[PDB]
Amino acid sequence: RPRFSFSIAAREGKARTGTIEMKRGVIRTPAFMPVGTAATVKALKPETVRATGADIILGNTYHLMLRPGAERIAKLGGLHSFMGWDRPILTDSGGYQVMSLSSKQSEEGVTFKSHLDGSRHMLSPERSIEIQHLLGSDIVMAFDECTPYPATPSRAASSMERSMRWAKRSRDAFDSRKEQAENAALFGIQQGSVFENLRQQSADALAEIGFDGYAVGGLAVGEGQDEMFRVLDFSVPMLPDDKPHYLMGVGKPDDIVGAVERGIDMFDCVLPTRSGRNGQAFTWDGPINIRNARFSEDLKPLDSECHCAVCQKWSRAYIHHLIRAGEILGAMLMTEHNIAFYQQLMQKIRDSISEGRFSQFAQDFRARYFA
Amino acid sequence: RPRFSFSIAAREGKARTGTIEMKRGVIRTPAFMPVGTAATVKALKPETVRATGADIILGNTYHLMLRPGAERIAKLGGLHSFMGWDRPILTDSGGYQVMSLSSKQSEEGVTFKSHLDGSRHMLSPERSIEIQHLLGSDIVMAFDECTPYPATPSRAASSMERSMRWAKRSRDAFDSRKEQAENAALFGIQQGSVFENLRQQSADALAEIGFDGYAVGGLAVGEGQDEMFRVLDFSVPMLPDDKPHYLMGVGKPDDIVGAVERGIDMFDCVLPTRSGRNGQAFTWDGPINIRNARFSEDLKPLDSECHCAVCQKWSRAYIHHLIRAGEILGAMLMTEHNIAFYQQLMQKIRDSISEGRFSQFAQDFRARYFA
Ligand SMILES: CNc1nc2ccc(NC(=N)N)cc2[nH]1
Ligand SMILES: CNc1nc2ccc(NC(=N)N)cc2[nH]1
Ligand SMILES: [Cl-]
Ligand SMILES: [Cl-]
Ligand SMILES: [Zn+2]
Ligand SMILES: [Zn+2]
């Protein structure tokens, strides 16, 4: 079993489908990664996450370093053993949460106060890589400096250029740790906001360093789908074609389809889990809010085609009751269905690309989903 | 498959072990019934409830008549289909929640305002039985009038005597509904508080009417274990020996053991589910609070002997993290373990009675549990 081997089995336009082979398992691409920020995909046992079709989940350096702690997780045997997920885990590097959740930045790194208890903590390229080593991540993200949306040209350039210097420091720290370099992979993060020249400068710097995969940062932060697709149109071709392309934080089903049409291979977002707990269920006819009174006596499953265990066993009417009553089983069932729906979407994307009918799939998907 | 057949396979002192055969399955006794007040055992799929060893669960007339509604559940196919539990369900009649949760009593019945939205509702012996018919309950409880603890002799007698008249009305309403009389069972509820003469009067009235089983009401309401055991000492022998004896709302593991020693066959309580969500895990060495800092790096399972799936797969340290983080999976894992622990306790009770070593089991259990 290889450390990291990406193979493209089929193409259609800019879209690709294939596999990433890693020591802990195969990742089918395009892939959707359920988010497991606090060492759990919310409301699901790991076996249920696997049963939905997920090949890999996402963890977070920032959250786990605060609770329960990186050294503690390593002492307990690593993140895989701790949470009971034995397949690949990608960990974000913490740069986004430093901006979004915490409350001093320099070239060396960043010091910050935890949002949970105000205790002071430090992150740097070297410390982020070390934390991801302690967690035992399979895909390690380079540590970057993020800037809020909407970013001015000056702030976008400044954070991107520092991110590129930090990408080289992340590369060197990873390569210095033998066990990490032999068993994990390292992805760089392209920045530059909506500005084509900065995206190009960022892509050039990352390719010169060399990574196992390339993420597109700085999207899914409020820009809207038209603008995101515009940025992807020019940004993805700048990345090495022969390595995976990971769009961080995306997204809604239609966002995923359009991003695949633009060359993206990997995705993560909290939408299926978080909005599931809030009562939103994804269906091939668009999302529904199960709390709506129209579902109070609806005996049909959440989605009429979905193969998930929830749709085999429980009605909309029951799940409507559970969510309106605040019952934990409502969160469990909505989340399992939504994650299974996302995996079925990815499976349909992969099959349609492999069969050379992805264009028609995307058209049919949109016509029905937005009808 | 019979409507209702109780068979005692073995005895030791006042303790009994055996089976209740019903159309939807066999109930091994002494039995513990997980509580599923809102058409769910909190945080567990029904298949997980079954995997812990539960033969029967408890639902509630008062809660289900308010949300989602009894006629609605019947229109949707009954409670079993609605929640996905195909085995026996016992439903309490609502008399306790009218007292404990709602906010006018007469000989006919009771009118009350819902605790959820203040809407007005009515309950009576006839309406309670009808609601339990609409739900499709397998074991129907007679509708009683409860009085708060501690009850004066006057209030205990008054509520008991009305309860006995309402027990006859419950019997007649059940017998008038052919489908119910042919497929379900009906239990009476002995009242009389801590007063031996009232317990005797109540037992005499219930036996004259005749029921499939006899519950002991009015305990687990604050009286303490010594007093409860004292009341059981004289109350249980008053009930027909050849029918099941159901102690409502009990209880802690040691309460269950002592009640079995006094002739009780069936139990229900929210303790394993509710306290599980709050961080209390049951072990053979007594309860632990998993949130305590001493468990932060403990790799052992919740209990060293427990056969449940949680103890096969996750450490105390992980569950400690989950509960302290407010994660739903923490509630799921704690609840599964606690319900499995309760079922393993019942299995050890049943086996020890069948083998004529229940006295020694109870002594060994207490010496270790309270060490
Ligand atoms: C919620 N949206 C969302 N977009 C993202 C882009 C990037 C990152 N992380 C990173 N640059 N280390 C996280 C994101 N989260
Ligand atoms: C929580 N304790 C607790 N003791 C109980 C006794 C009786 C009942 N119900 C009834 N008489 N219809 C419920 C109980 N709940
Ligand atoms: Cl989430
Ligand atoms: Cl509960
Ligand atoms: Zn489904
Ligand atoms: Zn266990």
PDB file of N, CA, C and O and ligand atoms in Angstrom, chain A residues 42 270 273-274 277, ligand 3:
ATOM      1  N   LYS A  42     -20.396  14.864  13.648  1.00  0.00           N
ATOM      2  CA  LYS A  42     -21.436  15.079  14.652  1.00  0.00           C
ATOM      3  C   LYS A  42     -22.639  14.163  14.456  1.00  0.00           C
ATOM      4  O   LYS A  42     -23.220  14.076  13.363  1.00  0.00           O
ATOM      5  N   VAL A 270     -19.416  21.690   6.273  1.00  0.00           N
ATOM      6  CA  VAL A 270     -20.316  21.348   7.373  1.00  0.00           C
ATOM      7  C   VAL A 270     -21.783  21.334   6.971  1.00  0.00           C
ATOM      8  O   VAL A 270     -22.603  20.887   7.766  1.00  0.00           O
ATOM      9  N   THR A 273     -24.029  18.044   7.655  1.00  0.00           N
ATOM     10  CA  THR A 273     -24.163  17.739   9.077  1.00  0.00           C
ATOM     11  C   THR A 273     -24.896  18.856   9.821  1.00  0.00           C
ATOM     12  O   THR A 273     -25.922  18.616  10.472  1.00  0.00           O
ATOM     13  N   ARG A 274     -24.393  20.088   9.712  1.00  0.00           N
ATOM     14  CA  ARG A 274     -24.963  21.203  10.462  1.00  0.00           C
ATOM     15  C   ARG A 274     -26.409  21.476  10.054  1.00  0.00           C
ATOM     16  O   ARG A 274     -27.292  21.603  10.911  1.00  0.00           O
ATOM     17  N   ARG A 277     -28.901  18.796  11.271  1.00  0.00           N
ATOM     18  CA  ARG A 277     -29.358  18.977  12.642  1.00  0.00           C
ATOM     19  C   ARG A 277     -30.401  20.080  12.745  1.00  0.00           C
ATOM     20  O   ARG A 277     -31.277  20.023  13.613  1.00  0.00           O
TER      21      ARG A 277
HETATM   22 CL    CL C   3     -21.152  19.950  11.612  1.00  0.00          CL
END
